[PDB]
């Protein structure tokens, strides 16, 4: 059952009578039961890197091996929970101890027992029925938003020998029993899964459907697919909270997981204060987002292993909800803090440095983490697709993206939303830099846009071209002044200003811009680019004429259209239905057509 | 309840190696157990078990191993880890880095024996920082105001007066007065004259009753310098989270602590990490710096101001680099202002209090503060840009607006930043100086201040 | 075609055997079955990262950037399994592929690969950001075996000369572009403006090509002369007078 401590040196504890141990198995060391991971075996002895502070551990103290590597207790009771990176429940540690601290060597179970949840067994099952890994043997109605699909562990299979009737159960009541090769498994609602092992699936599907954030720049110019991998430069001035809160208040995702990889203590507590108070509309009710998120929060002084395991816990939770057929999203508030934790582990393991002091495996640890994103056919029989979208923020020192964790992340992630302090200093919320930013997902989402938004492919192209042309034209404006540009270039710059001021900016602090649906977004852009095409047409059509058209003529004779175009952002989906917003936008199209027809 | 069992004393020293005495035949040693050594001449020494293996215990002795003797040395094992003899009576008092008193007062009558290492404050029980601490220094309070519960370093360099700034903060620091404040002044690696300055300046210049002062001297044994922040923070946690105080913890030079990590790492024979410091230096600095913040259900809080001598004047160095990842901002002390004889030489431009926007404003200070600080930053930044333009164009080419910004820079350095070491300015007296400077511009030039704030505060 | 796939989440040590399984299969197909095999090895960078991981875990001696001191030998065990052999009709061509870390041509992965493989084709953000597909920057590129694979029976007799003059004009174009960015187009001579017009026409016509557009070598050399003809005959200092007399006016 347990070995004995033989030696100690900082976090490293050598233990004896460990003959039955396994590499990377998880152990409770000392009478205080400090958590530690076996980093080496040397016969009847193990070397355990204790995560927590080892001060006071004694030779001959017990060393209880848990039969498992670092693992997440999955089940009902996740939603709204806050955990540290090794999956300890921070709300329960506080409420059970009545202390402000996390005690050294907490034993508290991560999904609280003695809470009873309403379980419904899946009504088709019977004694003698065949069942396979990922089959849903019931549902737990824990929240109005999220119904937890209880399912067979991925490695389990067999013939059902018992199923619990509809009723109230805690996570350790036996809900299902089944037999295979003459051996019975008794299943709890809690399911334990190794945190560094990918949860398997029937198929890793191509990602094709957009993760609407409700943000014009993001949802139009740099879409992230559901199942997509993306990064944000998480820094002071950038406004990283805007995407985080917008995803929370509106996103096309069913469950959201956050990971704090070792945030600053106050910044972590700002996030943990805010999210209980955030709300979203559901079936015409307004409800707290804590009904559909879980927070894997660590401060910079949590054990190194909690910071390094933080992403692996967050993704293992996210894969668990993905296997229920929920379209999960998740964020890591800085993968650089996770890479500092990984660097420290590596320094304590005494491994060779690679680039900038980071371990050799940093690139493969990042790439194997981001590869756990995607859309999938889940395991088991109910033919359910799910996904995990991963929003891993990066914190390049001084903004230098060549930094190994940032550079490797940007080498892997298919979308970069380049938030920029210069835009935030101009109050250009959401502060996304459209020159630095990119998305690789266009080629997939073009199927969705061709089916549902067939005008958008031209519009997206024209918008990016107008913005790129304005960046070149601004150098000519500096060289020879705005008045020296050609009429085509002047109207391009004026429309680019309209896009920058009243499309790419979005006042998320106010009801009309709190979210911006795709039907609103495409409609606004359809009008701005229709104005561009007709204005530039009138200019080029009247080239070499006596009565030449120019931006000043347009502003004088039909400046009401520019005023209306800037006004279109103020339409509110909560007041006026999308059909009414689209009809008003169609009236602005007719108004500008009649105005251009009045000139040429 | 407590350790009822009698202490073992061992003569079984199997070796000595630099700062380490290697006991053998030890019965069930603890890692980091404190031990009391007796030399052959009867001199008492202290040490802590640095490593254990079966019957062996590698004691890191505090004082140097001069006089240790494998045949006649004896080592009394305490059975326990290091505990602070903590109490509220540590305010008004001066301790050396071990926690032994040096103010000629008695030993501390402990209210509890808290473990020096503490435990992590639960992320769920932290609460966001929300009210200012006045430091008394205008270049901090009116430009970089410190939210109570913030961590904010004073980045400095060898030769700069950061110790005088830290002592001035300790004398002047307090709540805003729109009672229960205290300072813990943990001083590490202090040369003997700077230790006389801290001890004597706090005694003479009207401060002791609010402050607990730890003095680890430059030549005090290095592991006592490692203990000193843990010892001080354990006191600050007692005062803040049990006596409900608002504590300010000042750490006087984290670079001399970082040098002590490097030495204690080499004592364990760990391989040197990034630029010779331990790989885990980030976790150790977090273990110091994160013993800070407000907490839910308690009025008390710990602010921290880690002073930090940047090696080679370079903020890229791992000591300031890792500090900048953990602390909410920085304050920069600048050799340019110091050579210009501007005291305190705090450069308000590369300084940034990350939480100032939640320290100040209506019901926390005066409601103008956020606007005044943003506009003072703009007028100083533009005035520096104009001094760099005057170098090129010559004074007659400057516009009237440029000449105002150049006069603002002269007066801002001579009245706002310049303060002197015994002048204490409330946030209100600092904002009044802020206005009497901004009042140099035409009202329309104050573009970073709203017209409402101007109509209330621009009229003199 | 045969595919060996090691995905990003598959165990990193398999990367070391993955290109060896591919080459072992290619040796069977190309020497036992005498096929012309083309071997494509994708992200030799991820192979070299697996070498760096193993050495870091074994504590083997580091060369540059922590890669194994023997990395050239290990890459040679992969890359030298290429080429024709006596009495076999078959052949193993290889096109390794690698992401250069931080764009650094001097990095150990592209450097040791550059010392083993015969020539390197380079692709560049300085072309791709300007939408120039395929983004092949000729200037740092070179094919060591090209000198033999061109001229009569293989390609037109001009090819060896035309290639070297395209390099001269493209390179001088980059050099006068670097001058223009300091001194402006007023300091450039009429010939320096022609090297800038060459650079523009070269990237637009010679490099840029559709993903399903196929161009013969002969069509490529015709486009080569349609660009070299921008300069007066006497400027073409890499080409022989006989080659100019046969091909410059055509």
């Amino acid at each position: 059952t347990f070995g004995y401590v033989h030696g100690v040196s900082g976090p490293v504890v050598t233990a004896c009578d460990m003959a039955g141990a396994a590499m990377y198995e998880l152990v409770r060391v000392g009478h205080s039961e400090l958590v530690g991971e076996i980093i080496r075996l040397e016969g009847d002895m193990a070397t355990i890197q204790v995560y927590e502070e080892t001060s006071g551990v004694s030779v001959g103290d017990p060393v209880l091996r848990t039969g498992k590597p670092l693992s997440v207790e999955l089940g009902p009771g996740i939603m709204g929970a806050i955990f540290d990176g090794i999956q300890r429940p921070l709300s329960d540690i506080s409420s059970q101890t009545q202390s402000i601290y996390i005690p050294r060597g907490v034993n508290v179970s991560a999904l609280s027992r003695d809470i009873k949840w309403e379980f419904i067994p899946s009504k088709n099952l019977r004694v003698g029925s065949h069942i396979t890994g990922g089959d849903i043997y019931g549902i737990v109605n824990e929240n109005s938003l999220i119904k937890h699909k209880i399912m067979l562990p991925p490695r389990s299979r067999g013939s059902v020998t018992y199923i619990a009737p509809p009723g109230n159960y805690d996570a350790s009541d036996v809900v299902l029993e089944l037999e295979f090769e003459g051996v019975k498994e008794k299943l709890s609602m809690v399911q334990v899964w190794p945190v560094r092992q990918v949860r398997p699936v029937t198929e890793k599907l191509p990602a094709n459907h957009p993760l609407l954030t409700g943000q014009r720049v993001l949802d139009a110019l740099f879409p992230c697919v559901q199942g997509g991998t993306t990064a944000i430069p998480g820094a002071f001035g950038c406004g990283k909270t805007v995407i985080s809160q917008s995803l929370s208040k509106y996103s096309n995702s069913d469950v959201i997981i956050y990971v704090g990889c070792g945030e600053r203590g106050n910044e972590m507590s700002e996030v943990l204060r805010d999210f209980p108070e955030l709300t979203m509309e559901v079936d015409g009710k307004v409800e707290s987002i804590m009904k559909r998120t879980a927070l894997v929060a660590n401060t910079s002084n949590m054990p190194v292993a909690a910071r390094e395991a933080s992403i692996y816990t967050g993704i293992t939770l996210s894969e668990y909800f993905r296997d229920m057929g929920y379209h999960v999203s998740m964020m890591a508030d800085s993968t650089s803090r996770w890479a500092e934790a990984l660097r420290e582990i590596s320094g304590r393991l005494a491994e060779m440095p690679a680039d900038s002091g980071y371990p050799a495996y940093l690139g493969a640890r990042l790439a194997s983490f981001y590869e756990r994103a995607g859309r999938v056919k889940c395991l088991g029989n109910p033919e359910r697709e799910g996904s995990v979208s991963i929003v891993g923020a990066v914190s390049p020192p001084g903004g230098d993206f060549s930094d190994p964790v940032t550079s490797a992340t940007l080498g892997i992630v298919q979308v970069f939303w380049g938030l920029d302090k210069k835009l935030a200093q101009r109050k250009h919320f959401p502060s996304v830099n459209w020159l630095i930013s990119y998305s690789k997902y266009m080629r997939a989402l073009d199927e969705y846009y061709d089916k549902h938004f067939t005008e958008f492919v031209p519009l997206r192209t024209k918008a990016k071209e107008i913005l790129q042309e304005e960046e070149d034209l601004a150098e000519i404006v500096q060289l020879v002044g705005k008045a020296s540009l050609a009429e085509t270039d002047k109207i391009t710059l004026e429309v680019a200003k309209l896009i920058k001021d009243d499309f790419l900016q979005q006042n998320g602090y106010t009801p009309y811009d709190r979210f911006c649906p795709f039907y609103k977004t495409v409609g606004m852009l359809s009008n701005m680019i229709s104005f561009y095409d007709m204005a530039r047409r009138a200019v080029e059509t009247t080239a070499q004429s006596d009565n030449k058209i120019t931006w000043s003529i347009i502003r004088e004779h039909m400046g009401e259209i520019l005023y209306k175009l800037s006004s279109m952002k103020f339409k509110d989906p909560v007041k006026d239905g999308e059909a009414k917003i689209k009809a008003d936008y169609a009236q602005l199209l007719e108004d500008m057509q009649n105005a251009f027809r009045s000139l040429e | 309840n407590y350790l009822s069992q009698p202490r073992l004393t061992y003569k079984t020293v199997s070796g000595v190696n630099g700062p380490l005495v290697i006991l053998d035949h030890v019965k069930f040693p603890r890692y980091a157990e404190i031990v009391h050594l007796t030399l052959p001449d009867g001199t008492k020494r202290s040490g802590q078990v640095l490593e254990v293996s079966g019957s062996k215990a590698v004691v890191q002795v505090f004082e140097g191993t001069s006089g240790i003797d494998a045949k006649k040395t004896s080592c009394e094992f305490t059975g326990d880890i290091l505990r602070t003899p903590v109490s509220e009576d540590m305010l008004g008092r001066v301790f050396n880095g071990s926690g032994k008193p040096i103010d000629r007062g008695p030993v501390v009558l402990a209210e509890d024996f808290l473990d020096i290492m503490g435990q992590p404050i639960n992320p769920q029980c932290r609460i966001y920082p929300e009210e200012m601490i006045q430091t008394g220094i205008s270049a901090i309070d009116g430009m970089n105001s410190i939210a109570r519960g913030q961590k904010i370093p004073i980045f400095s360099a060898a030769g700069l007066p950061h110790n005088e700034i830290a002592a001035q903060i300790c004398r002047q620091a307090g709540l805003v007065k729109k009672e229960n404040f205290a300072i813990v002044f943990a001083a590490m690696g202090v040369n003997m004259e700077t230790a006389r300055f801290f001890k004597s300046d706090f005694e003479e210049n009207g401060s002791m009753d609010n402050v607990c002062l730890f003095l680890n001297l430059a030549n005090d044994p290095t592991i006592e310098r490692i203990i000193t922040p843990r010892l001080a923070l354990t006191t600050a946690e007692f005062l803040a989270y049990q006596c409900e105080k608002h504590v300010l913890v000042i750490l006087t030079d984290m670079s001399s602590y970082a040098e002590a990590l490097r030495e204690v790492s080499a004592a364990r024979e760990e391989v040197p990490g990034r630029r010779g410091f331990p790989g885990y230096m980030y976790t150790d600095l977090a273990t110091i710096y994160e013993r800070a913040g407000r907490v839910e259900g308690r009025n008390g809080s710990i602010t921290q101001i880690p002073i930090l001598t940047m090696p080679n004047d370079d903020i890229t160095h791992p000591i300031p680099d890792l500090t900048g990842y953990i602390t909410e901002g920085q304050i920069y002390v600048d050799r340019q202002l110091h050579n210009r004889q501007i005291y305190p030489p705090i450069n308000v431009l590369p300084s940034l209090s990350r939480l100032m926007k939640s320290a100040i404003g209506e019901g926390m200070t005066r409601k103008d503060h956020a606007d005044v600080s943003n506009q003072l930053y703009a007028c100083y930044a533009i005035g520096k840009d104009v001094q760099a333009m005057k170098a090129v164009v010559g004074e007659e080419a400057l516009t009237s607006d440029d000449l105002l910004y150049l006069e603002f820079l002269q007066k801002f350095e001579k009245n706002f930043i310049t303060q002197g070491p015994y002048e204490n300015r409330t946030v209100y007296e600092t904002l009044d100086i802020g206005w009497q400077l901004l009042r140099i511009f035409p009202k329309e030039m104050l573009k970073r201040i709203p017209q409402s704030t101007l109509s209330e505060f621009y009229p003199r | 075609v045969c595919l060996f796939l090691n995905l990003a989440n598959d165990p990193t040590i398999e990367r070391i055997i993955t290109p060896r399984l591919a080459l072992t299969t290619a040796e069977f197909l190309a020497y036992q079955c005498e096929k012309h095999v083309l071997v494509i090895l994708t992200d030799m960078s991820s192979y070299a990262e697996a070498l760096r991981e193993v050495s870091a875990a074994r504590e083997e001696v580091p060369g540059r950037r922590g890669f194994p001191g023997y990395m050239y030998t290990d890459l040679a065990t992969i890359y030298e399994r290429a080429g024709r052999v006596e009495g076999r009709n078959g052949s193993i061509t290889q096109i390794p592929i690698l992401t250069m870390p931080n764009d650094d041509i001097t990095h150990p992965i592209p450097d040791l690969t550059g010392y083993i493989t015969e020539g390197q084709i380079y692709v560049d953000r300085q072309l791709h950001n300007r939408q120039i597909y395929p983004p092949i920057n000729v200037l740092p590129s070179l094919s060591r075996l090209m000198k033999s694979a061109i001229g009569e029976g293989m390609t037109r007799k001009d090819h060896a000369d035309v290639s070297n003059q395209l390099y001269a004009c493209y390179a001088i174009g980059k050099d006068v572009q670097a001058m223009k960015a300091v001194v402006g187009e007023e300091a450039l001579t009429s010939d320096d403006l022609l090297y800038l017009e060459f650079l523009q026409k070269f990237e637009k016509n010679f490099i840029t090509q559709g993903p399903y557009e196929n161009r013969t070598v002969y069509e490529t050399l015709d486009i080569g002369w349609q660009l070299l003809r921008i300069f007066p005959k006497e400027m073409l200092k890499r080409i022989p007078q006989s080659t100019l007399s046969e091909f410059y006016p055509r």
Partner: peptide, 23 residues
């Protein structure tokens, strides 16, 4: 780092040899 890591390994090997020689 590599030199110092090999030195620390060689010292560990010397300790192991000494522990065997004490048999």
């Amino acid at each position: 780092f590599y030199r110092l890591k090999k030195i620390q390994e060689k010292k560990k090997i010397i300790k192991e040899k000494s522990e065997k020689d004490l048999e």
